[PDB]
Point group: D2
Amino acid sequence: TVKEQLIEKLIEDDENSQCKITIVGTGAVGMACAISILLKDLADELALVDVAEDKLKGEMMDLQHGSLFFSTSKITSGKDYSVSANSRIVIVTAGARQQEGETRLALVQRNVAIMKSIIPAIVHYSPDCKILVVSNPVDILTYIVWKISGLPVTRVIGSGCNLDSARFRYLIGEKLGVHPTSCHGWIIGEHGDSSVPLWSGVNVAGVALKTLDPKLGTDSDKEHWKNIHKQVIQSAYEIIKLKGYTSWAIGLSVMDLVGSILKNLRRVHPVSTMVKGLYGIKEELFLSIPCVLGRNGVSDVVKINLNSEEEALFKKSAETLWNIQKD
Amino acid sequence: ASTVKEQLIEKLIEDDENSQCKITIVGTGAVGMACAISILLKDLADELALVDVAEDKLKGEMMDLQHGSLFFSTSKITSGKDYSVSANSRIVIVTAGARQQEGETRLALVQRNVAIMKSIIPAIVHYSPDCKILVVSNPVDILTYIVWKISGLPVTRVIGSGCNLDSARFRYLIGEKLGVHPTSCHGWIIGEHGDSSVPLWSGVNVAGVALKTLDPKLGTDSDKEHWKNIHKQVIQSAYEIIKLKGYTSWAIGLSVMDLVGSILKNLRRVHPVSTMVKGLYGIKEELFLSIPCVLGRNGVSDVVKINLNSEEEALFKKSAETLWNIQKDLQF
Amino acid sequence: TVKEQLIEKLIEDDENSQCKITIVGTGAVGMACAISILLKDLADELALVDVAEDKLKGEMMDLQHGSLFFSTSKITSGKDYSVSANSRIVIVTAGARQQEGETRLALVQRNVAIMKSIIPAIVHYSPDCKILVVSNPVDILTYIVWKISGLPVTRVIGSGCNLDSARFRYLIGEKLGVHPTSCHGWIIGEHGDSSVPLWSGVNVAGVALKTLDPKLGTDSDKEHWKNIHKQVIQSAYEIIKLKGYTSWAIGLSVMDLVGSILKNLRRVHPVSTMVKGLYGIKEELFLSIPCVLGRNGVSDVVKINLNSEEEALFKKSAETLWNIQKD
Amino acid sequence: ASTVKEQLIEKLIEDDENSQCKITIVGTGAVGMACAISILLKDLADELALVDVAEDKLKGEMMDLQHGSLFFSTSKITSGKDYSVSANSRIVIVTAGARQQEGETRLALVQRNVAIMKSIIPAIVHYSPDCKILVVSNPVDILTYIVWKISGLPVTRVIGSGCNLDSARFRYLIGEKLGVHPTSCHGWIIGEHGDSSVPLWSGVNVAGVALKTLDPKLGTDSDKEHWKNIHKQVIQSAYEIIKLKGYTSWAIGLSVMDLVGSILKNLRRVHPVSTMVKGLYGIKEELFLSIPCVLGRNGVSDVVKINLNSEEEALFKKSAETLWNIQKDLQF
């Protein structure tokens, strides 16, 4: 053998993965998460799970054919969740696709069925993992995943408002001519139409914007038609109209979150977490609030004093969420 | 926010909206966007401009990337049907290309591609006179020749993705079998892209050890280990991927990002890309095949002359005849 | 020749540098800037200038011997400023070393002599460069460099408070258990003992700390002995006691600034810039204020409303600076 | 700030102050700190612990790095005289070493180094039972043998920086002369570090072309081009640097960072590092020389057997005798 003539083996093969990530569901979103994670040198091994076996092998082989150009050494796939064994993080992009004419409670209840059939095996093979839930509606889905999972709140996280908060701060910095790292601003609460922009806390280069324009973000805003929160929500809705998914953007957001957990950065992300007993919520439910993400999941949450407008939107969101969740 | 900027920011210099490291991608199907996401995640471009004919798809993709722009370092994403949006690109990446229909002639497909390229390549060159053109569509070898001929650009500046992806996978699998990082492996696949590419087993070495010195039957049929399988496995995987999925989007996007790197950063790394080989490797007509090229900021600055063994020279020179026979049927 | 047999040249050698950086003065600080810049893939070519010719060649050759491990392709040096030709950025670390027993005005005036002899050649060979002044005292030295240089204010920048502001925000995030990217806070004004921490604007995860503790940073602070501004100033003074220079840290800070200019990031840094007609200053002088740094130097400055304590310290600093500068 | 944290942060999980990717550097002179700054700027370590005997220098350097910690990703910088601060390191990097005085014996210098290593290596191993030890001090080949013998650790886990830096410069200059990126060049310098290292001209190739095939007199004295100069130029530069400056700090720090990379990331890249060669390359006693090793998270997992030409086998085997003759004079 060429190998026997070229290499003298001194130690047994250590083939264990140290930073293994599994992606569940390999449509546009899961695949965007995949290429994003591969390209940012985050995993030793990427495992893909889906029911569409043919397409699944196709994606895995497409990624493998380019292996020299990313640092992950092992890509695997399969319909059987045993390939997910011993993951640090399992990203759930699978989930029901709302058929037009379907009620909201029906869409959620189909997802209970899906999650009931995938979440317990995820936990079986990967008992110390974190679960990152990315499918819509992310907040009530993360609640469903967490309930089925049996795991502490700290290790079941929904992607939530991280993407929209990022786009928000970005546009603020664009309009001001300043890099995004100079801008603080959160969108919190229920992902999507009902999300709450925290205009009271938005600040750039150490200056609370509301001291420059106390009307900023309100109906009295003299530039109200340029409202940046509305630009963020409309944009994603237009993208979904056009494409079907904000798939590149979500994959980018999920790569942001993974980097915080795997590298134990203790960066603050507005992600879906249990908010019972926080922010005036009294029942079990998941909403986005600013969380400190690190190697053990959510290690801390940030307590923010919402103005009365912000508290009102946030609590209305929780109310509608719980009225779905009760059924 | 307009009043916020006035109270917060005091200008010393007018905003220069000039991009010094612009890239345009023509075609926003699966291959184009895989190139986009790979380039963006690698901090290569000042600006990424996207061109396509379909309004929804074009706007959808541009906005999708924009919605997540906090997470990459490229700062401007632009798109348009008008090739004016591509002006002053460093590289223009052509992924536009006709798809071969059931029972469509190969010759007729290339001819449809001739018509496409006659429509876009002049505009590209008008708006970016100093760009390098990176041709990615299939069949890449003939298409890069067509793009160059239409471009009226210096030959060093029109480059096909060629065999860069297959050679990379070739080296990687050679590394896998030996249990060594692929940066320790040297190995080229050259020539025509796909089925008839030539693997240079004669020059394959790992850690400064030519593997022919350890097994002179390597890569032949009389090989007991059948290292020959590795070239076949490379060529087969690409057909398998297309059969199970539809296209090889992620891997071409990875390969294109690798090429953009060498050109923008002037790495002067060697890639087996599609360039004109007239007067090289014993060819005497204007045709494009993959040979190992030094790539930098001017495109192909140099080519590596490899002595091919007689099996390698014959496989290669046959592909040059294939390409020349296609070019003869071609018009324009 | 092996080369003639291996390579067919098709195009002439393009040997021009696109991102050339020159470092002036190759003591501990200049060399820390050098290894920091090399290691962050910022320059096509690094040029080193010093009067100690032997040590200079030694440093250049030490860097060259490791060339495979950084991305810069060309390292050059020489006592003659012609090697600095066509730099994007010239970092001046040279400058007088205060002999014990020397007055402050004497130290500054020796630097006028030094700068008079190096700055005009810098501008000769590199007419469109930016000049980053790093030697102490950085504020009045940047003023001196700017006057001699003839260049606009936008392209003569002192390193100023960037390092100390960074350490400041860092310690805030350390004490709170949160990554530094969650923390805004500036130190501005005169570098060193007299610098002004802007406690009124310090905020973490979108929360102005002064709303949680209105006494934070003052004499009434119940934890006043843990004052983080004082920790930052004392630390650098202790390091200099021990080492002679905060050389690794300044080299890190200068690499931060270079990355903003070269990559046109429009990030906000508190650097030494002309503050005549800003922040209540009436004469020509350089102090640190938050500047937007990009490829053409300082493109913008950030206007902050200082509390009366902060305005008082800042204006006292300017007063003492101008009373030196007049001589 | 204590009251600020209570109002701003709500804990869900107790702070785990455990580092999963710790590195210790022993010695905070020029070589140690150049290793520190290189590792920190490359995002390699969770924590960097520094050990030295001199209180001022140790505290000064640790605080200098800490004052600028916003600008690197390592989050904890620790230091101490007590080797307890090094506990649970992945790698311990030994730069501590005696300096040869005017008229000091080489043998007596190694013997002073024996005494130093007998003082620190047991503590290191006690506090980090699973670490890999990376020996950097000179003379590295003999010192790595001493460290290993004292360590009582598996041989695969005690590694000298060896020829990694000189081979890297060898390849780089070969790339320079040819106008090609060095990642296209393969070329090893092996054996004893410094004056008597063996360059493997027999295996030097660029882009899958063995350069002996193009000029069989390459690297010999009868070479018209005198490529032989490149090994000499490499060996000479290191003496020149020391003569003009005092030490080769930046380049060793760069080389150490390269080695740390392969080990922490389990790259399985090949480096010419100092390891034990008993029963390899025709040696029969326990000694350390540089040979091409596969480095990963367990240290040396494999070695590349290169067929050396007779000039290469003789130069190499002579160095093994030199090292063995020094070890004979050695005690303990």
